[PDB]
């Protein structure tokens, strides 16, 4: 009958960390015969996740790509790959940043997690230098992790902040360094510019 | 800012490759055009006060009601804001001429333009009428390749407003 | 990942030398005791559900607070997470026992675990107590496997003990 | 194939944008270079038979062992394959000159080069020696901007082999 | 992607031959007319919004059906889609005019378009009429002197016409 | 480093599962092979000085030109680096025997091999000739399952160079 | 479209759950509001002809220039298109009242509105003036909860135009 | 089905790599264990009828209530389904012994077990009771490494039910 | 994936029966010959690069057309792709030989291959000829490994041959 002394509520930890909207992140799936209302939801979700809650002006919207998604010519997975290869992505996350910062940005944006070890950095830095940017971006989208979790119709969502099967222990603290909050973003447009949140020293 | 030079460098970096003759040829094209672009930029800068005042008056001639009371053209603050805005447009056009790309115009004016204009109830048609006035006067001032450069940057704005 | 053999090679490489006969002899001894090691790993895997259950029962009897309202193992969502964590730690201890080296335990399980718990507000000392309770159950199974040839397994039991102890010390 | 023209068009398409002055300036740079590049291409084409013969002989002089029996240089089929390969290199260089990009060289020669050369046990050093011989002879044939164009495409190959 | 130069190279490669002097001459002529070509491409880009608007106004006056309820350009979502399509086709025609080859138009814009329209229930003949209306407007702008040195641009105009015509024939 | 033991543990960890009889059977295979692998490793270590000397001499016999002046084989420093490299190969072969996987060879030698050899102009063929020399001499030293183990690790290197 | 019923079903489907009391309570809220919403819809339908006529005249009074020659208000075709557009707005408002959501308004009017208005140079302010006229007249016709429902859908349009 | 052999091949395929000595050593472990595993499998097959009969009776003794009317143990169909289910378990255990992995058990029994058992209200404790009875009888029949193999597959089931 | 053991179980399961003594006998024989099988798998992997190279040289001597301009093995990009394909097929045949079943070969390599080749325009009969040339080289290595104990490997050679033959028949 008597309560626990400490006595936090369930969700207290999430409340305290500010991960309460993403710890169990909602999953948005594009469904067949989707309404126009339904498609707009998916697009919003994509832009938020893939571009790191940075603002996209109406001039920057892709439009032709969305034409395909509405048609069914492409899947959510293909759409995500077009956005990641686009100059919208490249300008923010790639051109100003270093590779170290770019790689971890890609994990957060596309996989929804933090890099688990310095070997992931080593692999993706190596790919870029041998095969350039597009091959790199393809790796994340064409990976068992991507394919098993999201597959084709699910928009990527935040997987960190919950235990994933091959996760290292460093994975949850690293997601905390990557997450600024609901109002956070990963924006190039800052005083310091794009810097590495997750050092090599950390990995 | 998008310029010929930044764009070639960006492409090379994406491929992770040293710049090749393909990129350097493009770069050469920018540097050759620069003489005509500079000539345009100097002329627009020299006539900028007169260009702006005529541009603003043309908007008031085309839309007489603005000047009438209870309307956006009425009052000194409103009229001053007009001259400020057209001056911004000229400034970013001359910047684009010198930069060798539309990037200055794109980053300063084009991004967010539609949202800003909606919120403040600023009609794209007023700006377009001013730019068209400028285009006519520039045509008198410049000829040939200078003129071509000028006209292209003014046209870019007009299409973005449209 | 690292195992006992891999660790010896890495050391010799830094010296830039062929493995010495003494180093070879140590490795041969590991191979000689490998059947016992396999039996120990089997004992943990075969009794894994019982190990966790017995630990959990003891933990919640010792610390009534966790299961009371507001406790860290209350309600069902949290209780489920607690049981999941115990199973993960046991898994990694078993991995380390096959490897003969604690690195897999350190690199994947232990590093950042304490930080995670502190951020969550999970009580680290209780987590450590859970690992000690699991250790006692597990070691019992290793010490009394069924139908196995009678022998001295004490060195392997001590090695298992150290892996549990490392985990506890990291978490706390 | 990557050329100045295809690259600007591809960029515009990726952004889903009409071609603007930035792109057209790059395009102009290709068309200005074209006169020197065409002159280079004609000289390489006219002397291609002699260029290949000398290049192959240079390889045999630089590596005398190849000519000895049981070696890759020995025998008619092997020697014929040499002349064929050097001719390919020249042909794709002239194509790149006329195309206004390295794209012809990239698609036909550079892609897959390392894997193919490994499997067939073809040394990069033989090719490099032949290309350098050509570069010296071209230097006699061409001067100024034609020479600069020629040298760039020969150097691209040399670096890819290296 | 392919351009007129690249197309000639590909043909010569299949023959395994150095480009012929006649082939070279054709390419040299393309370089000679390149300034005029750049002017034409500029004219389309500079007047792009006007071209689409003028076409759209004419289309909806000609075919009241599309804008009525039950029409394909009703309601605003459909009308917006229609205007988007017109802009895309014009974009690709302009690309083709710079390239000097219709491939970019054919490979990206045109391929599968008729099938898509038929599935949607969009009337292909109306789409084709829109492309023809755009053509007449666009050709006028290239034809206008516009403070550009006066010359004969007839070949460029004819080439532009063919690209429009290809698009219309594919859709129809 | 890939070994039988690390690979079974990695599989289990990926699925997030306890090690089962499937894994333990695999592990038993590594520990049974170990006695033959150790015997091979001891023999390679005992004759490693002689194996290296003969291997280096074989390279010079197979490619006589190297020894001539201005060539990679010529000079003390060059010859010393040859002996160093072959020694490295032997060392990583013995390590792979003891580790129970190709992982030591893979991480130390095979990764980056092609890029290093290209930059320093080191021919894969010289190494292959040396490894083949060793393989013949090992065949004299070892028999049966030790010999089989040795041959597999030498073959792995030869294929990686190839 | 978006209605209370479709939205609760969509939520349940996303979580992959059967509809629970939470959803059914929401649904009951829609069915209770229906009586007020129907009354509003009938009143707007009865006066729709008069509402549109007055709304169009109001626009002409608020912006006298439009009626002058060479302007959008001038001519029968233009005036007819005005009456058509305002009538559409009323029709989609009554649909939204009956549907129990803004979904009919969203799918027919709001989606694509900005792009259409830009291309055809139709000012949002003319529509907003007409809607505000209707809102005043509706206020006379309806009272209480019917009036509240009506006002909300008219306001939704005004905000979307704004 | 997961077996030692399929798992090594799957790993190789994932890396896109040829099978190496690391994989072949694992494979050797499977083939050596096969002698003990076959002996276990033959013994379980020979005594399968007796093992099942005793297991079913043990469940009825351990939970006397089941046999009482209105309970799941009562009645011929129910008793028949019990014997069928225990027989399935034994069959998949012998399959796993022969296959050299837990894969047969995993694919046929373990996947979907919890959902099926919930829907049909089948207690894991009844199965666990039967398996433990079998384990005791097998212990009488087999000794040494055969016994160890048998025990591992019965234990896998017990943990999955637990 | 499937292996020889797994295949027998699946059959017995469909009958819903304990494996028959006859079925068991076949499996026992597979275990008895497993050492020879391991040697054969080793022979292919150890000589894999040579097998592909030797095949490639023979193929291009037989079919000069493929390497000329217009051929499917011209230019370097295509030649590289051809060599990649040969290596993939050999990999899967070696996997099948370890498994003792061709299913892995069929499901991962062979399924869809003919359709892919027809779309590409790759000549399937030449691909099949390449697989036959690889087979002759590979079988030679299996037949003559160095320092293996002398024995009859004929059944293993035949089994290898069938996997090569399956691949060839599927491709063409
Ligand atoms: C060579 C002169 C010296 C040297 C180099 C060296 N570097 C690494 C590892 C890395 N180097 C980088 C560098 C970059 N990151 C970037 O984003 C950029 C610019 C875009 C660069 C240049 C990175 C990311 C790594 C780490 C990841 C990786 O290894 O791929 C090493 C390897 C060290 C290790 O232990 O991993 C080395 C050796 N080292 C010397 O000794 C030279 C003097
Ligand atoms: C001139 C054609 C007409 C006119 C214009 C006018 N503008 C405003 C207000 C704003 N104008 C801008 C425009 C810009 N801000 C920028 O940063 C840039 C790019 C560099 C531009 C071109 C902005 C943002 C505002 C709104 C906020 C502000 O006050 O600065 C007004 C006042 C509208 C108001 O009530 O806020 C007016 C009237 N004036 C005329 O008389 C012409 C009709
Ligand atoms: C059980 C003995 C104790 C307990 C556990 C508990 N843990 C969590 C939450 C998490 N646990 C982990 C831990 C891991 N992640 C890893 O990477 C590893 C090994 C590599 C482990 C062991 C993680 C990441 C979480 C957060 C994600 C999640 O919740 O799934 C909780 C829940 C905390 C919350 O409020 O959500 C609990 C309760 N708590 C106790 O009371 C025991 C002492
Ligand atoms: C120590 C934890 C307890 C113990 C172990 C023990 N085991 C053996 C002997 C063997 N162990 C096995 C078992 C395996 N070999 C494998 O391949 C696998 C996985 C597939 C297992 C589980 C084998 C083969 C043997 C040898 C044959 C035999 O049955 O004797 C011993 C004897 C000494 C030795 O290992 O050589 C012992 C002591 N027994 C105890 O008393 C401890 C409590
Ligand atoms: C000349 C410096 C030396 C030499 C060369 C030689 N080359 C080959 C074989 C090939 N060379 C190529 C190269 C190309 N094929 C292409 O498609 C392109 C790009 C358009 C190139 C540059 C290829 C692919 C082959 C292999 C296939 C074939 O035979 O056609 C050989 C024979 C290689 C062999 O052993 O099979 C030789 C010898 N010959 C000399 O005398 C010089 C040392
Ligand atoms: C306007 C002249 C005519 C018209 C057009 C119209 N189009 C659609 C829908 C689509 N149109 C396209 C076409 C393209 N997508 C592309 O990416 C390209 C280039 C490769 C084109 C040209 C697509 C894919 C769609 C479907 C997806 C979408 O709706 O955006 C519509 C909408 C029809 C509907 O019911 O959804 C319309 C109305 N219709 C007319 O009546 C005009 C004659
Ligand atoms: C044909 C569509 C119409 C026409 C064209 C025309 N243009 C020129 C000359 C030039 N045009 C340009 C234009 C550009 N060069 C560039 O670099 C760019 C993009 C940055 C453009 C738009 C230039 C540089 C010239 C040369 C200088 C000059 O002004 O003469 C001519 C003259 C012939 C020529 O090819 O130079 C003509 C005929 N003329 C018409 O009347 C057509 C309606
Ligand atoms: C021997 C067959 C021939 C020869 C060899 C030689 N090697 C080098 C230089 C290097 N060799 C290596 C090789 C390794 N370094 C490593 O880290 C490893 C893995 C553990 C190996 C196998 C490297 C990296 C170098 C280059 C850098 C260095 O100097 O260490 C040279 C000199 C190369 C140069 O261009 O100066 C030589 C000559 N010498 C002979 O006589 C044979 C023909
Ligand atoms: C009335 C306030 C003013 C006016 C309006 C007017 N409208 C148009 C043209 C269009 N109106 C619409 C709007 C709709 N179409 C729909 O499908 C819907 C939703 C179901 C609406 C509300 C559209 C799309 C058009 C353009 C296409 C068409 O002609 O049908 C015009 C003509 C615009 C032109 O310049 O071509 C006018 C004038 N007329 C007046 O008198 C007021 C100033
Ligand atoms: C025996 C311990 C007790 C008992 C059992 C009993 N079982 C069922 C029904 C099912 N049993 C299974 C189990 C399996 N089906 C499979 O495919 C496999 C894996 C190969 C197993 C192990 C299934 C799925 C059923 C349900 C479908 C069916 O009816 O066939 C019943 C009847 C279920 C019911 O709800 O009526 C019973 C009673 N009977 C006893 O006496 C013991 C208590
Ligand atoms: C070599 C014997 C012959 C040859 C080969 C060749 N193949 C391609 C292209 C492809 N080949 C494949 C085949 C596979 N990919 C796989 O993953 C597998 C296993 C499932 C196989 C066997 C595929 C998918 C392609 C297409 C995409 C790609 O290139 O990777 C080519 C290139 C085709 C072209 O002309 O572009 C060639 C040349 N052709 C010959 O001449 C040989 C007889
Ligand atoms: C057939 C391809 C040729 C052949 C084979 C052959 N092999 C053996 C004997 C053995 N084969 C091995 C080899 C391995 N076992 C493993 O676990 C591994 C990977 C780690 C290998 C490569 C072993 C252990 C033996 C047994 C011991 C021995 O060395 O004799 C034989 C002998 C009889 C048998 O059935 O095992 C034979 C016949 N011999 C030929 O002549 C063919 C060309």
Automatic annotation (TrEMBL), chain A:
Compartments, record wording: Cellular thylakoid membrane
All copies of domain PBS-linker, residue ranges: 8-187
Domain of life: Bacteria
Family label: Belongs to the phycobilisome linker protein family.
Protein name in the entry: Glr2806 protein
Species in which this protein is naturally found: Gloeobacter violaceus (strain ATCC 29082 / PCC 7421)
Origin organism lineage: Bacteria, Bacillati, Cyanobacteriota, Cyanophyceae, Gloeobacterales
TrEMBL record, chains B, D, F, G, H:
Keyword Protein biosynthesis: no
Keywords: Antenna complex, Bile pigment, Chromophore, Electron transport, Membrane, Photosynthesis, Phycobilisome, Thylakoid, Transport
Binding positions for (2R,3E)-phycocyanobilin 2 per the UniProt entry: 82
Gene Ontology terms describing biological process: photosynthesis
Membrane topology: Peripheral membrane protein
Record has Membrane as a keyword: yes
A Pfam family assignment: Phycobilisome
Cellular component, GO, one term: phycobilisome
Superkingdom as given in the UniProt entry: Bacteria
Subcellular location, principal: membrane
List of residues binding (2R,3E)-phycocyanobilin: 60, 81-82, 84-85
Compartments, record wording: Cellular thylakoid membrane
Similarity comment: Belongs to the phycobiliprotein family.
Stated name of the protein: Phycocyanin alpha chain
Organism: Gloeobacter violaceus (strain ATCC 29082 / PCC 7421)
UniProtKB/TrEMBL annotation, chains C, E, I:
Binding positions ((2R,3E)-phycocyanobilin 1): 35, 39, 149, 151, 153
GO CC aspect terms: phycobilisome; plasma membrane-derived thylakoid membrane
Membrane topology type: Peripheral membrane protein
GO biological process, one term: photosynthesis
Domain of life: Bacteria
Primary location: membrane
Coiled-coil spans in chain: none
Membrane-spanning parts: none
Subcellular location as annotated: Cellular thylakoid membrane
A Pfam family of this chain: Phycobilisome
Binding, (2R,3E)-phycocyanobilin 2: 72, 77-78, 82-88
InterPro entries, alphabetized: Globin-like_sf, Phycobilisome_asu/bsu, Phycobilisome_asu/bsu_sf
Keywords, ordered alphabetically: Antenna complex, Bile pigment, Chromophore, Electron transport, Membrane, Photosynthesis, Phycobilisome, Thylakoid, Transport
Modified residues (N4-methylasparagine): 72
Family to which this protein belongs: Belongs to the phycobiliprotein family.
Protein name, UniProt field: Phycocyanin beta chain
Organism, scientific name: Gloeobacter violaceus (strain ATCC 29082 / PCC 7421)
Gene name per UniProt: cpcB
């Amino acid at each position: 009958l008597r309560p626990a002394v400490g006595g936090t509520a369930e969700a207290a930890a999430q409340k305290q960390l500010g991960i309460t909207a993403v710890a169990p992140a909602s999953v948005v799936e594009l469904r067949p015969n989707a309404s126009e209302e339904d498609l707009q939801g998916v697009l919003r979700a994509v832009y938020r996740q893939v571009l790191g809650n940075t603002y996209v002006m109406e001039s920057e919207r892709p439009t032709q790509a969305e034409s395909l998604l509405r048609n069914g010519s492409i899947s959510v997975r293909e759409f995500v790959r077009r956005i990641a290869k686009s100059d919208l992505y490249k300008e923010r996350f790639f051109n100003k940043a270093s590779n170290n910062r770019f790689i971890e940005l890609n994990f957060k944006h596309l996989l929804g997690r933090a890099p688990y070890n310095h070997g992931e950095i080593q692999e993706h830095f190596g790919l870029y230098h041998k095969a350039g940017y597009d091959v790199e971006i393809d790796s994340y989208i064409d990976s068992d992790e991507y394919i098993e979790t999201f597959g084709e119709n699910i928009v990527p969502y935040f997987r960190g902040f919950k235990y994933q099967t091959n996760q290292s222990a460093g994975g949850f603290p690293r997601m905390v360094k990557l997450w600024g909050g609901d109002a956070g973003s990963d924006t190039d447009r800052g005083k310091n510019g794009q810097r590495t949140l997750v050092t090599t020293k950390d990995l | 800012m998008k310029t010929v030079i930044t764009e070639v460098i960006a492409s090379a970096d994406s491929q992770g490759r040293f710049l090749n003759n393909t990129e350097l040829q493009a770069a050469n094209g920018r540097f050759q055009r620069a003489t005509a672009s500079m000539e345009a930029a100097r002329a627009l800068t020299s006539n900028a006060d007169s260009l702006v005042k005529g541009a603003v008056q043309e908007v008031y001639n085309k839309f007489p009601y603005l000047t009438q009371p209870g309307q956006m053209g009425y009052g000194d603050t409103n009229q001053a804001k007009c001259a400020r805005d057209i001056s911004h447009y000229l400034r970013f056009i001359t910047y684009s001429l010198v930069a060798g790309g539309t990037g200055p115009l794109d980053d300063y004016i084009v991004a967010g333009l539609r949202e800003v204009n909606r919120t403040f109830n600023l009609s794209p048609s007023w700006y377009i009428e001013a730019l068209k006035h400028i285009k006519g006067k520039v045509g008198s001032q410049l000829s040939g390749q200078p003129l071509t450069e000028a006209n292209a940057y003014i046209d870019y704005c007009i299409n973005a407003l449209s | 990942m690292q195992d006992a053999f891999t660790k010896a090679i890495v050391a010799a490489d830094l010296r830039g030398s062929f493995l010495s006969e003494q180093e070879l002899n140590q490795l041969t001894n590991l191979v000689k005791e490998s059947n016992k090691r396999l039996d120990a790993v089997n004992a943990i895997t075969g009794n894994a559900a019982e190990i966790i259950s017995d630990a959990a029962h003891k933990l919640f009897a010792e610390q009534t607070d966790l299961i009371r309202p507001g406790g860290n193992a209350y309600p069902n969502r949290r209780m489920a997470a607690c049981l999941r964590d115990m199973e993960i730690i046991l898994r990694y201890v078993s991995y380390a026992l096959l490897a003969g080296d604690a690195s897999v335990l350190e690199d994947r399980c232990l590093n950042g675990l304490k930080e995670t718990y502190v951020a969550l507000g999970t009580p680290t000392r209780s987590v450590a107590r859970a690992v000690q309770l699991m250790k006692e159950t597990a070691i019992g199974y290793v010490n009394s496997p069924s139908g196995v040839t009678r022998g001295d397994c004490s060195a392997l039991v001590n090695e298992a003990a150290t892996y549990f102890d490392k985990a506890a010390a990291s978490i706390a």
